[PDB]
Amino acid sequence: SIVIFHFSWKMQSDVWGTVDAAGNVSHITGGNFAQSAITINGWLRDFLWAQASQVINSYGSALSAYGLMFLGAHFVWAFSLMFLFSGRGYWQELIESIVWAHNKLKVAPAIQPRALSITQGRAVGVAHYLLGGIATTWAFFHAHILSV
Amino acid sequence: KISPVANTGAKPPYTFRTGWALLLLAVNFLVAAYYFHII
Amino acid sequence: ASFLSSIFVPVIGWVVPIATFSFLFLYIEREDV
Amino acid sequence: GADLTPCAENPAFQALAKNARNTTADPQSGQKRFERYSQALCGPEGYPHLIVDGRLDRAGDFLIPSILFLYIAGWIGWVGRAYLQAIKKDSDTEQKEIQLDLGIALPIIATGFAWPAAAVKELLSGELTAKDSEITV
Amino acid sequence: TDYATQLCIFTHHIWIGGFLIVGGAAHAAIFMVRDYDPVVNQNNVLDRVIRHRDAIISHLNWVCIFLGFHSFGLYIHNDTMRALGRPQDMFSDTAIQLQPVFAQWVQNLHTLAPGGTAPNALEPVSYAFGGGVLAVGGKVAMMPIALG
Amino acid sequence: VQRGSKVRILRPESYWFQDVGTVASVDQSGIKYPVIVRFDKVNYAGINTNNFAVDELIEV
Amino acid sequence: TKFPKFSQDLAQDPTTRRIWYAMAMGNDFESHDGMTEENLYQKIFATHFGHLAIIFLWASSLLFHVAWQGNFEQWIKDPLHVRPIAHAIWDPHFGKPAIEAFTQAGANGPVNIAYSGVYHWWYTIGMRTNTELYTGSVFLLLFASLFLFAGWLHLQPKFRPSLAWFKSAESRLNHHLAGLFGVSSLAWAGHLIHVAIPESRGQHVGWDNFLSTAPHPAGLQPFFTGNWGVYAQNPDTAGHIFSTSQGAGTAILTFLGGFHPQTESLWLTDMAHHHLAIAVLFIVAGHMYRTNFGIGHSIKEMMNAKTFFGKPVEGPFNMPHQGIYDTYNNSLHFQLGWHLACLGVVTSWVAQHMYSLPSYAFIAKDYTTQAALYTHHQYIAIFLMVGAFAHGAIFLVRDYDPEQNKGNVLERVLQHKEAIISHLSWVSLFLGFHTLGLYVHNDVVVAFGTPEKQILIEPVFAQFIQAAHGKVLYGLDTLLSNPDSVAYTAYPNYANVWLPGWLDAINSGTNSLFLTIGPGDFLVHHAIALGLHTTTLILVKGALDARGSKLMPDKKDFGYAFPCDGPGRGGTCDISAWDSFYLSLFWALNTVGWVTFYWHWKHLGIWQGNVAQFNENSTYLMGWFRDYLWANSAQLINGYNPYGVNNLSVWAWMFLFGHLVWATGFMFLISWRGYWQELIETLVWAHERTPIANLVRWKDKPVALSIVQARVVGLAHFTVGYVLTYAAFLIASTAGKFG
Amino acid sequence: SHTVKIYDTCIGCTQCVRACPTDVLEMVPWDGCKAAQVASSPRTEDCVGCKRCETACPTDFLSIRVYLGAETTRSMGLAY
Ligand code: CLA
Ligand code: CLA
Ligand code: CLA
Numbered sequence A: 001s002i003v004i005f006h007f008s009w010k011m012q013s014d015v016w017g018t019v020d021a022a023g024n025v026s027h028i029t030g031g032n033f034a035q036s037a038i039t040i041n042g043w044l045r046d047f048l049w050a051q052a053s054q055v056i057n058s059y060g061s062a063l064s065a066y067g068l069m070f071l072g073a074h075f076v077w078a079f080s081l082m083f084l085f086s087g088r089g090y091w092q093e094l095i096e097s098i099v100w101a102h103n104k105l106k107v108a109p110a111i112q113p114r115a116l117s118i119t120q121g122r123a124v125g126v127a128h129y130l131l132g133g134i135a136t137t138w139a140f141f142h143a144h145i146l147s148v
Numbered sequence B: 001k002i003s004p005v006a007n008t009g010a011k012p013p014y015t016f017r018t019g020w021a022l023l024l025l026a027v028n029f030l031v032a033a034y035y036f037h038i039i
Numbered sequence C: 001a002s003f004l005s006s007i008f009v010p011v012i013g014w015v016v017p018i019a020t021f022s023f024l025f026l027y028i029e030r031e032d033v
Numbered sequence D: 001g002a003d004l005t006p007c008a009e010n011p012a013f014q015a016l017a018k019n020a021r022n023t024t025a026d027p028q029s030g031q032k033r034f035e036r037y038s039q040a041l042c043g044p045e046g047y048p049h050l051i052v053d054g055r056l057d058r059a060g061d062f063l064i065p066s067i068l069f070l071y072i073a074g075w076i077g078w079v080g081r082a083y084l085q086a087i088k089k090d091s092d093t094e095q096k097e098i099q100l101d102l103g104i105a106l107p108i109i110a111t112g113f114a115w116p117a118a119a120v121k122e123l124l125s126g127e128l129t130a131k132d133s134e135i136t137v
Numbered sequence E: 001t002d003y004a005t006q007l008c009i010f011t012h013h014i015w016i017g018g019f020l021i022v023g024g025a026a027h028a029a030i031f032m033v034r035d036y037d038p039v040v041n042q043n044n045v046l047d048r049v050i051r052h053r054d055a056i057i058s059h060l061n062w063v064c065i066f067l068g069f070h071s072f073g074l075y076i077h078n079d080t081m082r083a084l085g086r087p088q089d090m091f092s093d094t095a096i097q098l099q100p101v102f103a104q105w106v107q108n109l110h111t112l113a114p115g116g117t118a119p120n121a122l123e124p125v126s127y128a129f130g131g132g133v134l135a136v137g138g139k140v141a142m143m144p145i146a147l148g
Numbered sequence F: 001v002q003r004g005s006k007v008r009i010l011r012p013e014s015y016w017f018q019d020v021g022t023v024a025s026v027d028q029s030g031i032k033y034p035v036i037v038r039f040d041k042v043n044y045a046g047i048n049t050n051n052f053a054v055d056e057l058i059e060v
Numbered sequence G: 001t002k003f004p005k006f007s008q009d010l011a012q013d014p015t016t017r018r019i020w021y022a023m024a025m026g027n028d029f030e031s032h033d034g035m036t037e038e039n040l041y042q043k044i045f046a047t048h049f050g051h052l053a054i055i056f057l058w059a060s061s062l063l064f065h066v067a068w069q070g071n072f073e074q075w076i077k078d079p080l081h082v083r084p085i086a087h088a089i090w091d092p093h094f095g096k097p098a099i100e101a102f103t104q105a106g107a108n109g110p111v112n113i114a115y116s117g118v119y120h121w122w123y124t125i126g127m128r129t130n131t132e133l134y135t136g137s138v139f140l141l142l143f144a145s146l147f148l149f150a151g152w153l154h155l156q157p158k159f160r161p162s163l164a165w166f167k168s169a170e171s172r173l174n175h176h177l178a179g180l181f182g183v184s185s186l187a188w189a190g191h192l193i194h195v196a197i198p199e200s201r202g203q204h205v206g207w208d209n210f211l212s213t214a215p216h217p218a219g220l221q222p223f224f225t226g227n228w229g230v231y232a233q234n235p236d237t238a239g240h241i242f243s244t245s246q247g248a249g250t251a252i253l254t255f256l257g258g259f260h261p262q263t264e265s266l267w268l269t270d271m272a273h274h275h276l277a278i279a280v281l282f283i284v285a286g287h288m289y290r291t292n293f294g295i296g297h298s299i300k301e302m303m304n305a306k307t308f309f310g311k312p313v314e315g316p317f318n319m320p321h322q323g324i325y326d327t328y329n330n331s332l333h334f335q336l337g338w339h340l341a342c343l344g345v346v347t348s349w350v351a352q353h354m355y356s357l358p359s360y361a362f363i364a365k366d367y368t369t370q371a372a373l374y375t376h377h378q379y380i381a382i383f384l385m386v387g388a389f390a391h392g393a394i395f396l397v398r399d400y401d402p403e404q405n406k407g408n409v410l411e412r413v414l415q416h417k418e419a420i421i422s423h424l425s426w427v428s429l430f431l432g433f434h435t436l437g438l439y440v441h442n443d444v445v446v447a448f449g450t451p452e453k454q455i456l457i458e459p460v461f462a463q464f465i466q467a468a469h470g471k472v473l474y475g476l477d478t479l480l481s482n483p484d485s486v487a488y489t490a491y492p493n494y495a496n497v498w499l500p501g502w503l504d505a506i507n508s509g510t511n512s513l514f515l516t517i518g519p520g521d522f523l524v525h526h527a528i529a530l531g532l533h534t535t536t537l538i539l540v541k542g543a544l545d546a547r548g549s550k551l552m553p554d555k556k557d558f559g560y561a562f563p564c565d566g567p568g569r570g571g572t573c574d575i576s577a578w579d580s581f582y583l584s585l586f587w588a589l590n591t592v593g594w595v596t597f598y599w600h601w602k603h604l605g606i607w608q609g610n611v612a613q614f615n616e617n618s619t620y621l622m623g624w625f626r627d628y629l630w631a632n633s634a635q636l637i638n639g640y641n642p643y644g645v646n647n648l649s650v651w652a653w654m655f656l657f658g659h660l661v662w663a664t665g666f667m668f669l670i671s672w673r674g675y676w677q678e679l680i681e682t683l684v685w686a687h688e689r690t691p692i693a694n695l696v697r698w699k700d701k702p703v704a705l706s707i708v709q710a711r712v713v714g715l716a717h718f719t720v721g722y723v724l725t726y727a728a729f730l731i732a733s734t735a736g737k738f739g
Numbered sequence H: 001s002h003t004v005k006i007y008d009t010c011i012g013c014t015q016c017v018r019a020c021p022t023d024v025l026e027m028v029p030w031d032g033c034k035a036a037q038v039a040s041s042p043r044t045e046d047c048v049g050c051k052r053c054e055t056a057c058p059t060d061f062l063s064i065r066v067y068l069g070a071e072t073t074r075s076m077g078l079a080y
């Protein structure tokens, strides 16, 4: 994820841009990479806060879905943290109490319910953690250049 | 087996439970009557 | 009066840690307490 | 409340109706939408704010959709319960949950048009102390 | 000229290769638990690697700690100094500078290659290494990527 | 109890507490927990059987 | 080695685990080796005194630095346009541009601006000079010195109290209500009448002259003669100017009920009248009990009672409470788990009132202080509420005897344990499916360019409560808004003296008192209900399952905090009752963010004079990212820039600091031990095989952190970053803009 | 270090003693006239708390239990 930013911010700053017939190049961000890409706040300020303006303001336009896809990924990401941080022991106990309610109303299932395996819980998380991460910067990359 | 998991000692009508519930229910209808400007 | 901060800040950052960690380390590594 | 007014008196609703943003393929879908939302109450934004108080005047806001769900929802649950209990009598119960026996399910799915009539009829919904009680307390 | 395609095309393949490389390590372990025969692997290159696995990992652990301090810590030092109001103590281009002379060194060869080494070439292989600004319409297609 | 009869458990610290099941076998011996029982519902391990004492069981 | 004398087990550990676990359970006196109940209560009693000392010494610090390094004099002359400074700063690392940035609020050297609100509290209460603060600090130093001596005193054998003295419940409760609460409330009315209120009207009243000057021109005879109305005879005027004689009224006790116009704060005259009424009821409440004189109630008899006048009853409310008195007094965790809940609610009870009813002068206009105080107490309110269930879970484990209870309400609770856990799952699920989908329906439908189709529904019945207090903006004409109603004018006794002042404050709209609720306020209120339900579900489940559950029936044996039971039965990852506390605190923090983002964005629109941006854009979530989070963070990230450094450089550094700390916890949460201990074995091989480093060697063998330890370390990181991050945003966003 | 407690509900599966890596367990003859055998835990210092035996015991709830306690070099599995 740092490789794609090192490509994204540099080319916008140093390479990609508009050139005049005289020979003067006006890059997209104007050489901010030189002095701002040496501090973590500069990446937070000049790359994430600045270039994401088109995404949040995409509502009511053709790029409005990118604003949604940029956001729905954040949900899917934090949803990963359920399965990584937690453990099956909690979840099977909770399911046990819920099974009693179905036994009470005689809606008990034949296939007895079971919590997800330990390896699966780690698996389901990284699936969400990555899907939420990649899908986030996917829309941020799209809407930024599609406007610029 | 010292403690029964299930409770015992109550009849079908449940007079004591229903009496306090209807009171809590009546006051709820009262506050609604003030909201609807009935009173 | 501002000279007190010049003497109290460093001892809090240097002297007190060095004294506490040095005592605590030798205390926990002691064989008989 | 909260500076809530009817639609036509509100100038905001009058302006938003011009900017149609036709949803469907019909060209006049945008105008027909705003005209239909004239019945509701509009705030300073011009967006209709629905009152779910329970007023019979505003019953279409919450009351009518509310009943439409519960009739559908009880249809789904009552069908699933009867199909599940019906499977329990047969020999291999676990397999039918996966590979559905349509001979049993589709008659049950046909029913449920009147689930409350059947529901009140079953004063015994299977509840007893014979369930999973699961260490002493 | 289509800056949208270049980042998406660059970003896409960069992620695909990362996923596949991780799969290569997974199946390398699956081979071990399943198909590794000690009779076949007797004092070969593989058995000899398993027998000193501790030295391989312990030194790699040292490199990861060495770099992570001296790669991310420099950002922290610049972030700390810029907040302290000491912009001359940072690791920057005007302040203390860490120039990639070896990359600047290799860059210069490819610009001067079309003359001397592989002389049949007219232009440098890529204008990213060096040369002149190429302008398609108003957009710049590629230009020298300076390294600082 | 009789072999083959449907019986409920009262032994706590059991997966099938207050659950019905058939008696597969009964050991005519002095071993504690002689009666053998079988079930449809598995525990977490997947065993579908365990031995119980007669006092801990009420016939259904 | 014997580092932990409380544990022979940890001391006989060759690894470095002994160092970490010793830190953990060094405060757990119940687990200390050779600890009886008598020595237990005595050791706990002395520790309270030392903890009490740390409070007053910390209180002394606030007074010392504001006296030595604070512009309390200059702030009094212009409280609104002067920034209070907490303390000086001496960092050798600061460059010359930074020192110029922090030389703020008229300080010769660099200094930090204060945001606690003590300047408004010390000013309102009667302090007007820096030397007066020096006396408060020195007084608290000696006041703390008494407790530290008392704590050491009561550890000696002649002075060590007995266990029966500790178990005396009626006496402790009888004295606290009357003396601790009541007399302190009575005393507080004294300072307000003798010091604060006179100083508010310009009369200097210090220790030198409090005996000479009178609080009222009439003596103390109107109280004895029955002429109570003399004290409320002439009130302060609307044009009264604080700390001055202009518009000064002579009354000391009044019941105006509204806010002061100038300060936008409650009347000092009403606060003195308030605590006096409180002290009476509290003193009256004290004498109820049976302490020694034979007259009073026995809680044991009241709980174990089984009869009405003549009829049989199961107990109070026909409910059994046989062993509740013994369960309460004998179990310490029951009291602690109980008291933190009561204190946690009161902490939220504070915060809800401090922004609504500011009791200090010129504090509502100081927008940053008003926000930090609300965020402070609400964070604190939840740790106490979360800690309450943890000890409630611990009590069920170790301090609970089923035979002693045998049929009380507590035994009756746990018998339907499944219904409590089950229905809680319904409530949490029933909220989130429906609450989120409305945010999501509004997000999408606004994104497609049709905002009118948003599901907006007014918080109607909540308006009816606002209208039921006199707010006419909604036009419901309910009880206190309608003059014809009986509540507006009490027909038997026309004594509603509260009504004139109260109706002015609500219907003004200038202050924040029952602010205007809208459709955006609707959904966020239900989101809060989910955080409180789901956090309760986690805590209630583990607590009720603490003694046992299906996957681990014999959970009582292991204890509160154990890592697992093994890969058997396909699980056991997080089965303890400790892990329920663990997973709940994530919600308990998140539940604040929904509360504090709601507080911050709603107030920023009010303070800035733009109420629309909240009410308009708070329905769809994208407004929260764009209008609230994205925009307000502009000055923060620009704290230190390539061009220079402003006064907000600390918060930016703190903002990134919590981010790093928040992410460092993800390691201990995600990556678990078995990967790490293998890595440790390699480093051990290298050090034992590196030639020159063979000389130096560990005495304690290095091992990976335990499973429960890593959980502790991970959450502390998750929490610290959650705290410091929002703090820098809360302060810098409000302070840089000043509302 | 640890404590491995064996309860009355054993039936002599011999699965616990096999699953143990450190040979903490042993099957001994029981004085029960009709009871074939029963498990034992003679060398408890070598227990490494891996809970394999708890996974092996097929009773409804486990006849054998491993309660964690004071650690040492052997229990923590430290070759160093
Ligand atoms: C290399 C980075 C660095 C360093 C080393 C410092 C160092 C310092 N800064 Mg500082 N600062 C920095 C960067 C740095 N700054 C940056 C980038 C900014 C933003 C512009 C600031 C802004 C700043 C302000 C605004 C202030 C300081 C202050 C201070 C001093 C605090 C000393 C003190 O009270 O005791 C140490 C402080 C503690 C709180 C103790 C440690 C706390 C731990 C977490 C808890 C303690 C218990 C512990 C865990 C148990 C073991 C200990 C044992 C003894 C029991 C100290 C000299 C203050 C100052 O001037 O001095 C009064 C001050 O007010 N700094
Ligand atoms: C206010 C009253 C109060 C009292 C008297 C107690 C007392 C007790 N609690 Mg308790 N607790 C409380 C409130 C209280 N708690 C609250 C509010 C919560 C909710 C968070 C808890 C949650 C809780 C849990 C989950 C557990 C206890 C346990 C215990 C017992 C052992 C204490 C222990 O492990 O040593 C204290 C050891 C520590 C390591 C504490 C300090 C660690 C902090 C978090 C470090 C933070 C890092 C740093 C300072 C910040 C740096 C800042 C950065 C900017 C640099 C003890 C009886 C434990 C037990 O076994 O009970 C029998 C247990 O498992 N409590
Ligand atoms: C931001 C979060 C974060 C950070 C900082 C780390 C840090 C680290 N991880 Mg890691 N990890 C994380 C999240 C994080 N992890 C998450 C979320 C996961 C789950 C996927 C993992 C999973 C994981 C694995 C599986 C492995 C690591 C490894 C490592 C180490 C690599 C060595 C290195 O960079 O040198 C250390 C560099 C740093 C700590 C960076 C900051 C240090 C600054 C520059 C210095 C501090 C200043 C000063 C000294 C402070 C003094 C203060 C004084 C008052 C006490 C390092 C300790 C590897 C490891 O341990 O092997 C080496 C490894 O194998 N991690």
Ligand code: CLA
Pocket (backbone or CB within 6 Å): E069, E070, E071, E072, E073, E074, E076, E077, E080, E089, E090, G093
């Ligand atoms: C880890 C990355 C890193 C690096 C490389 C630096 C580097 C530096 N910092 Mg810095 N810093 C860092 C992280 C880092 N910082 C972090 C994380 C913080 C926040 C806490 C700070 C905060 C900070 C402040 C506040 C200040 C500095 C300053 C400095 C400078 C002076 C260093 C000094 O006096 O130490 C002296 C160093 C040594 C005595 C030992 C260094 C190690 C030697 C070279 C090891 C060599 C090993 C050898 C090759 C092996 C031999 C093999 C054998 C077989 C022969 C220097 C440029 C100062 C400054 O003003 O900067 C200009 C200063 O005041 N730092």
Ligand code: CLA
Pocket (backbone or CB within 6 Å): G044, G045, G048, G049, G052, G165, G166, G168, G169, G171, G172, G175, G176, G178, G179, G180, G181, G346
């Ligand atoms: C009248 C007699 C009397 C008094 C005054 C006290 C006073 C006290 N006892 Mg005590 N005690 C007594 C009789 C008395 N006891 C008797 C007879 C017994 C034997 C039966 C005991 C047995 C006993 C034990 C066993 C313990 C105490 C403890 C305490 C202390 C409680 C901690 C504290 O300061 O809370 C202060 C509490 C308050 C101020 C009230 C609660 C907080 C409310 C919400 C504040 C009001 C709201 C208001 C808005 C706050 C604004 C704040 C302002 C800054 C803005 C306190 C010093 C405990 C202690 O700390 O150990 C020393 C303890 O462990 N006592």
Ligand code: CLA
Pocket (backbone or CB within 6 Å): A075, A078, A079, A081, A082, A085, A086, A090, A094, G424, G425, G428, G429, G430, G431, G432, G433, G436, G530, G534, G537, G538, G583, G584, G586
């Ligand atoms: C954004 C992150 C996130 C989300 C969404 C949830 C959501 C939930 N958690 Mg949770 N949790 C999280 C983070 C999160 N958590 C973290 C970080 C922790 C700390 C480890 C926990 C710890 C935790 C515990 C300890 C517990 C929960 C519980 C719950 C549930 C409460 C029921 C509820 O409110 O229903 C609302 C549910 C939702 C809003 C999500 C439903 C899914 C969506 C809306 C619909 C799905 C359709 C899908 C889009 C279409 C299919 C597409 C196809 C590709 C398959 C719910 C599923 C509790 C529980 O389950 O008990 C009932 C519980 O006990 N969680």
Ligand SMILES: CC1=C(/C=C/C(C)=C\C=C\C(C)=C\C=C\C=C(C)\C=C\C=C(C)\C=C\C2=C(C)C(=O)CCC2(C)C)C(C)(C)CCC1
Pocket (backbone or CB within 6 Å): G059, G063, G133, G135, G136, G137, G139, G140, G187
């Ligand atoms: C006996 C008696 C009576 C005589 C009473 C007389 C003649 C005097 C009694 C005076 C009293 C009762 C004085 C109270 C003294 C305690 C004081 C003054 C201080 C308390 C301060 C605290 C606790 C801490 C305050 C803090 C500090 C220090 C700060 O600086 C900031 C605020 C805060 C943090 C709160 C009368 C004739 C009536 C009846 C007969 C019996």
Ligand SMILES: CC1=C(C/C=C(\C)CCC[C@H](C)CCC[C@H](C)CCCC(C)C)C(=O)c2ccccc2C1=O
Pocket (backbone or CB within 6 Å): A082, A083, A084, A086, A087, A088, A091, A114, A115, A116, A117, A118, A120, A121, A122, G573
């Ligand atoms: C939530 C959670 C669970 C519980 C998760 C469960 C039980 C997921 C269940 C997902 C689906 C929704 C179950 C039901 C699937 C039905 C077939 C869907 C009905 C069919 C219609 C939709 C058509 C774990 O088991 C776990 C284990 C280890 C670490 C972390 C965790 C963890 O975080």
Ligand SMILES: CC1=C(C/C=C(\C)CCC[C@H](C)CCC[C@H](C)CCCC(C)C)C(=O)c2ccccc2C1=O
Pocket (backbone or CB within 6 Å): G023, G667, G668, G669, G671, G672, G673, G674, G676, G677, G703, G704, G705, G706, G707, G710
């Ligand atoms: C990194 C990591 C380790 C290895 C971490 C180790 C060995 C800790 C090393 C940290 C050293 C000791 C420095 C820490 C110093 C702290 C900054 C201050 C702590 C001192 C307080 C007591 C005052 C584990 O052992 C582990 C175990 C289980 C789950 C996750 C993990 C895990 O993530």
Ligand code: SF4
Pocket (backbone or CB within 6 Å): A087, A118, G563, G564, G565, G566, G567, G571, G572, G573, G574, G672, G707
């Ligand atoms: S916590 Fe670790 S040992 Fe315990 S069940 Fe989970 S993965 Fe297995």
